[PDB]
Amino acid sequence: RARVVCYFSNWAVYRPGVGRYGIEDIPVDMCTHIIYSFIGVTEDTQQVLIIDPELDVDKNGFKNFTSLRSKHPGVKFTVAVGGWAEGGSKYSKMVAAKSTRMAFVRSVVDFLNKYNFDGLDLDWEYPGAADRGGSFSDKDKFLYLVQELRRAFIREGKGWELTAAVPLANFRLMEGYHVPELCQELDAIHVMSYDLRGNWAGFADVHSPLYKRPHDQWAYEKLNVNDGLQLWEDKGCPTNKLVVGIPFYGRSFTLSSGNNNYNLGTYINKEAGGGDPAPYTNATGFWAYYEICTEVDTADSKWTKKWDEHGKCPYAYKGTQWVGYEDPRSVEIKMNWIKEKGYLGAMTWAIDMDDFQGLCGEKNILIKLLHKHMSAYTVPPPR
Ligand SMILES: CC(=O)N[C@@H]1[C@@H](O)[C@H](O[C@@H]2O[C@H](CO)[C@@H](O[C@@H]3O[C@H](CO)[C@@H](O)[C@H](O)[C@H]3NC(C)=O)[C@H](O)[C@H]2NC(C)=O)[C@@H](CO)O[C@H]1O
Ligand SMILES: CC(=O)N[C@@H]1[C@@H](O)[C@H](O[C@@H]2O[C@H](CO)[C@@H](O)[C@H](O)[C@H]2NC(C)=O)[C@@H](CO)O[C@H]1O
Ligand SMILES: *[C@@H]1O[C@H](CO)[C@@H](O)[C@H](O)[C@H]1NC(C)=O
Ligand SMILES: *[C@@H]1O[C@H](CO)[C@@H](O)[C@H](O)[C@H]1NC(C)=O
């Protein structure tokens, strides 16, 4: 009764060559809940914004995805609104008044009926975040939105789920999330236990450390997966509502000129923006898991792979390039820890970045780990 929650990116179909990943590539039986990402909100009318209508509607992307339930009827197929690229300011605007929230709620209900989704995942990053167009009143008003969506979903009578993707840093929780009240209204809390470190921080480090390292200080002291989940519990969220995110990607850095120290915490060339783009994701500062294993794990690789003994994550480097990520060893450790803590399950950002082609070895190696552990695990009663 554990969840394996799989975010599916609708833009992965445009990746070239073996990176192309579409609806037909989703390994549906490895997940219990699959989430089509993303739709957005309009700036002016607070309605659902379809972000790639040629794919999502004209080529039947939404419906191809939800009709997967014909062959896989025990799986839930929902849609996520928001995501990083959507920004936060349209959401802070939409929740500012009862009337604009109600316009959005009606639009959501029509959309979910039209494309036969099982519910909605809220991915506003983030209520209350001044750097993302937010402000103080978002914390109350985001809770109101959640309460109003839940009531609308109850009225529709189809048993739709409502979930949310959330951060784990204390300051973000204080600015945006009434934890006990949100955890009561939501079916699952998808914790984004990743991007905890990255180029923006100004030093090289793994981005999903499980436990504190000696160099973690001040704001970073508790910014690790174990302490972040413990924070959600301490703030009032039941253990059996918390789903732990696992990144299928690494955060990369370009090290400072002449820097031969590759240890965690080493200085970087921050203006570079991160490591150089890899060929399929083509984004400075991150690599898909399959982009990492095809470079790091080959027989003649010139990459050097190391292990963070405290954070329990791999990192690898070559030249000026350094990347921290998750591999089968680190994912196995986190699966065992999820079971030890009694959490509701595991989530991945995102299923289209697993080695789904088997370029390095077993196809879908990381999601198979999530599925192996979660499917044999019984979630205990709240602690
Ligand atoms: C649940 C959750 O993890 N949510 C967040 C994710 O949004 C975020 O991943 C990033 O998502 C954005 C989209 O919101 C990606 O930007 C996209 O970039 C490509 C080209 O580089 C572009 O073609 C797309 O148009 C654009 N998206 C859209 C909506 O069209 C970004 O690359 C993702 N970053 C990754 C995968 O590392 C994840 C991980 O950061 O965490 C939350 O912030
Ligand atoms: C903490 C900080 O300096 N904030 C900015 C970051 O939000 C941002 O990247 C993002 O890191 C967040 C953690 O703070 C993640 O939650 C978020 O998923 C991630 N963004 C994505 C999806 O790529 C960086 C810019 O990339 O700027 C920082 O200043
Ligand atoms: C939906 O499935 C149809 C029939 O297989 C296919 O032609 C189309 O490309 C699919 N669209 C998407 C977005 O996957
Ligand atoms: C890679 O991304 C950059 C930055 O957006 C873009 O300008 C360039 O066209 C992209 N290249 C490919 C092959 O998509």
Residue numbers in the entry: 24 to 406
Sentences from the paper on this structure:
The glycosyl hydrolase family 18 (GH18) chitinases (EC 3.2.1.14) are enzymes that hydrolyze chitin, a β-1,4-linked N-­acetylglucosamine (GlcNAc) linear polymer, into chito­oligosaccharides. Among the eight groups of insect chitinases, group I chitinases have been enzymatically well characterized and have been shown to function in a chitin-degradation process that is closely associated with insect moulting. Our previous work reported on the group I insect chitinase OfChtI (previously called OfCht5) from Ostrinia furnacalis, a species of moth that is the most destructive insect affecting corn production. OfChtI is highly active in the hydrolysis of chitooligosaccharides, colloidal chitin and α-chitin, and exhibits kinetic properties that differ from those of bacterial and plant chitinases.
According to the deduced mechanism, this ‘boat’ conformation of the −1 sugar is likely to be a state that occurs just before the completion of catalysis, in which the product has left and the catalysis-associated Asp146 residue is still interacting with the −1 sugar. The O1 of the −1 sugar, which is the scissile glycosidic O atom, is within a distance of 2.5 Å of the catalytic O atom of the γ-carboxyl side chain of the catalytic proton donor Glu148. The C2-acetamido group of the −1 sugar is in a conformation that facilitates its O atom being 3.1 Å away from the C1, and this O atom forms a hydrogen bond to Tyr217. The pyranose ring of the −3 sugar interacts with the aromatic residue Trp34 via a stacking interaction. Because OfChtI shows activity from the nonreducing ends of substrates, the (GlcNAc)3 with a reducing sugar at subsite −1 suggests that (GlcNAc)3 could be a hydrolysis product of (GlcNAc)6.
